[PDB]
C-alpha cells in the first residue's frame, strides 16, 4: 500500500530532480529499485535527467547499478545517450557493466558513438568497452 506508493513518489522525485525529497522517501522505507511501467528505476531517471547528486545518493542506498528497463537499457546506456560525462564516470566506478546489451544488442558505446558523444566514447574505452562488440544485426559501434 504505502511502500508501493513511496516507490512511485521516489520515481517522480528522481525524475523531477528533488535531491532532498529522495533522501526522505528512502528513510520512510521506499524501494530504491521501484519500477515505472516502462521498467525504469530511479537511477535510470536520474541518470537520464543528468542529476549527479541523486545518482550518488541512490548508489549509496543500494540501487542496482545494472538494472535494465523494458528496452534493456541500463543507467549507463541512458547517461551515454545523452552525454552526461560525470554520471558515466560514477556509474563505472560503482560497477556498471561497460558492455551491457539492450534488447537489440547495443552497448553504451553503440549509443554514445551513434549520438556523437566523443568524450563518452573515450571514457568508455578507458573502462574496457569492447570496440568490436556487435549488436544483434552484426553491427559494431563504428
Amino acid at each position: 500500500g504505502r511502500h508501493m506508493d513511496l516507490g512511485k513518489k521516489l520515481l517522480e522525485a528522481a525524475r523531477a530532480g528533488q535531491d532532498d525529497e529522495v533522501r526522505i522517501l528512502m528513510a520512510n522505507g521506499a524501494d530504491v529499485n521501484a519500477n515505472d511501467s516502462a521498467g525504469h528505476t530511479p537511477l535510470h531517471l536520474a541518470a537520464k535527467r543528468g542529476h549527479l547528486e541523486i545518482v550518488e545518493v541512490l548508489l549509496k542506498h543500494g540501487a542496482d547499478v545494472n538494472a535494465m528497463d523494458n528496452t534493456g537499457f541500463t543507467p549507463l546506456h541512458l547517461a551515454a545517450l545523452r552525454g552526461h560525462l560525470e554520471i558515466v564516470e560514477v556509474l563505472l566506478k560503482n560497477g556498471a557493466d561497460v558492455n551491457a546489451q539492450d534488447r537489440t544488442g547495443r552497448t553504451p558505446l553503440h549509443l554514445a558513438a551513434k549520438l556523437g558523444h566523443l568524450e563518452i566514447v573515450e571514457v568508455l574505452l578507458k573502462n574496457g568497452a569492447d570496440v568490436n562488440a556487435q549488436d544483434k544485426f552484426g553491427k559494431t559501434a563504428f
Binding site: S37, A38, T71, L81
Partner: protein, 164 residues
C-alpha cells in the same frame, strides 16, 4: 500467444507517450516528459485471441534521429501519429514512412495513420486531408484522443490486424 512488435512514431509533442500510457495504464498524462526510447508490455484480447503487445514509444526530438534505423529494423508495425493542430507533424508522416520503407526494403509495411488530439476545438489539419493521405499510402486512418481515451484501443488493435 502471438507477440506483436508495435512502434509509435511521430513529431515532438503529438501525444505518442500519452497514447501509449493510455493503452497501458488507462490514464492521461498532462505533463510533457520528452521520450528517448521506452518499452511497454501488455497482454490483451483482440478479435477473441490473447496476445502480447510489445510497444516501443520513440523520440520525436530530431537529436535522436540516428536511433530510428534500429527500431525500424525491429518493428513489425508502426503507429504513425500526428496531432490535428500541428501541420508540421502531419507533413512529417512522409519522412517517417520513407525511412521505414528504406530500412525494411519494402512498400508494404504494416502501418496505421493516427490523427491525435481530436478532443481539441480548432484544428489546422483536415480530416479529409488525412483520409486522403492514408488512402494514398493504402493504410487505415484512426482519429484518437489520449485525453478522452477515444480511439485508443482501436488504433493499436487496428495496427495488430495489419500485422496479420
Amino acid at each position: 500467444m502471438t507477440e506483436y512488435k508495435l512502434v509509435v512514431v511521430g513529431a515532438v509533442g503529438v501525444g505518442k507517450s500519452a497514447l501509449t500510457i493510455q493503452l497501458i495504464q488507462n490514464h492521461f498524462v498532462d505533463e510533457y516528459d520528452p521520450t528517448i526510447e521506452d518499452s511497454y508490455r501488455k497482454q490483451v484480447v483482440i478479435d477473441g485471441e490473447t496476445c502480447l503487445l510489445d510497444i516501443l514509444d520513440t523520440a520525436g526530438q530530431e537529436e535522436y534521429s540516428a536511433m530510428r534505423d534500429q527500431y525500424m529494423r525491429t518493428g513489425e508495425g508502426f503507429l504513425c501519429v500526428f496531432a490535428i493542430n500541428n501541420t508540421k507533424s502531419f507533413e512529417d508522416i512522409h519522412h517517417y514512412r520513407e525511412q521505414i520503407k528504406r530500412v525494411k526494403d519494402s512498400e508494404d509495411v504494416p502501418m496505421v495513420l493516427v490523427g491525435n488530439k481530436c478532443d481539441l476545438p480548432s484544428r489546422t489539419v483536415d480530416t479529409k486531408q488525412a483520409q486522403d493521405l492514408a488512402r494514398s499510402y493504402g493504410i487505415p486512418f484512426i482519429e484518437t484522443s489520449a485525453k478522452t481515451r477515444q480511439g485508443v484501443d482501436d488504433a493499436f488493435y487496428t495496427l495488430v490486424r495489419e500485422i496479420r
